[PDB]
């Protein structure tokens, strides 16, 4: 009766979450319960597609709707579903986004550590798709998962002002700083902030585009033979 | 000093062409040429684009704003005669069009607008300047009066705030395969950052844009764009 | 264990009845500005210690930009000591690895000083 034991895990996870919903372990115990019996991916064929239809758009949209005014109640129905919709990897991205907005960084964190785990157990999943052809793992769902001294001296000096006033002022500051810089290295750092800043406001395409021009502008300057760590991240970012 | 009489001449005839027919454009249109043709290049800006020119006495303007609900032909004449002595006071040219739009002179307002639009397109440097007391040449509600990407985006920048625009710019890039498209998209991002008031951040974006064009060899292919980009980085 | 320690910062500092710490400095490792540091080590032990310390630092410094300061350290050290000759020598083989790596197009202060602080 793996079935019954699996109940029990969930039961304990329900309760753990109920008692402490800012604390990972319950979330973790559930993922397990849900992805226990799974030993090898579902039978696929034409275009990697699987005989399993995706999450009811209606349903997904409705969830994406609530996001602006999210509560501890939303988060529960999301989760209820990804307990019944094993492979819905996009919902594990929501759960993480929701949780992060409700104030639970650590749980978001965990939701993902545990997913990345599942994908290393059976990576065939990173390629599979639902009978409608849509991917088990989107590209925005996969960038999610993949992981200076004076650089952070401003970046942290700014992401602070990005919290007191909004993005508008964040940039406003970034500007007034740059006007008083001589060294290109610094000015390149600034522009680098601008990108990171847009990343946190939800500008995945506009941010990435700055990384592209920052990686090449660096590689062009031959920083692979001096300060290659900078260049190596820049490369990872621009994906 | 002889083109003094020539300008006055152009005005008298304007005065007349309107007296005889207040519902017909040309009169008003000539009045413009009397005032803006002598203007060949913009005035010397200083501390925050303040040009050493005084503005329209706010009291004298309040008065015109007062009268706006109950508008007569005598009001309209004083707006216009004022906007004859304060060449760059573009708010007057909105007030004239509003006066004219209520008084049923629908194609005159249109004209009053097209003619400004013309002048601004000629010396676009004016859009950003302002008077000694920092009151804008092209004012807030006046640029709204005269309004595919920088088209659609700076449209969204005025309606919603800046973030909504940046938000859109983002979802446009999402589909812009060819580097030309992308290059423009980042070019907009820059314009928009100057339109929000961070000059040096846009300058820094323009510097890397021209140096990127120059290196792609666009000077022998879209030299217009590369020579615009060049000055914007001064 | 990292979290449990992060939930209560005090548990680290504590010790049992017998004064034996809850968390050893051995266990804390299981979980967890050079000229500033070492230019004072020169006032204490002699110049010979200032170099012995500089050695253990460069043991791990995978970024050559760090190292260039680490050799810029070895330069500063000898310069202040009185050895003005072996000094300028070191500031030449540094100034030229700059013009080589293209540092007039990046961090060009470093350069402009390095030249008049060598010729």
Residue numbers in the entry:
A (entry chain C): 230 to 376, 383 to 474
B (entry chain A): 229 to 375, 388 to 474
C (entry chain D): 344 to 375, 388 to 474
From the publication, what sentences describe this entry?
Contractile bacteriophages of the family Myoviridae (i.e. T4), R-type pyocins and the type VI secretion system (T6SS) of Gram-negative bacteria are evolutionarily related nano-scale injection machines that puncture target cell membranes using a shared contraction mechanism. TssA subunits are enigmatic as they possess a conserved N-terminal region of unknown function, previously identified as ImpA_N (PFAM: PF0681226), whereas sequences located C-terminal to this region are highly divergent. Consistent with this, phylogenetic analysis has suggested that the TssA family can be subdivided into three clades (TssA1, TssA2 and TssA3). The structural studies presented here show that TssA1B, TssA2A and TssA2B possess structurally diverse CTDs that lead to distinct overall architectures for their respective complexes.
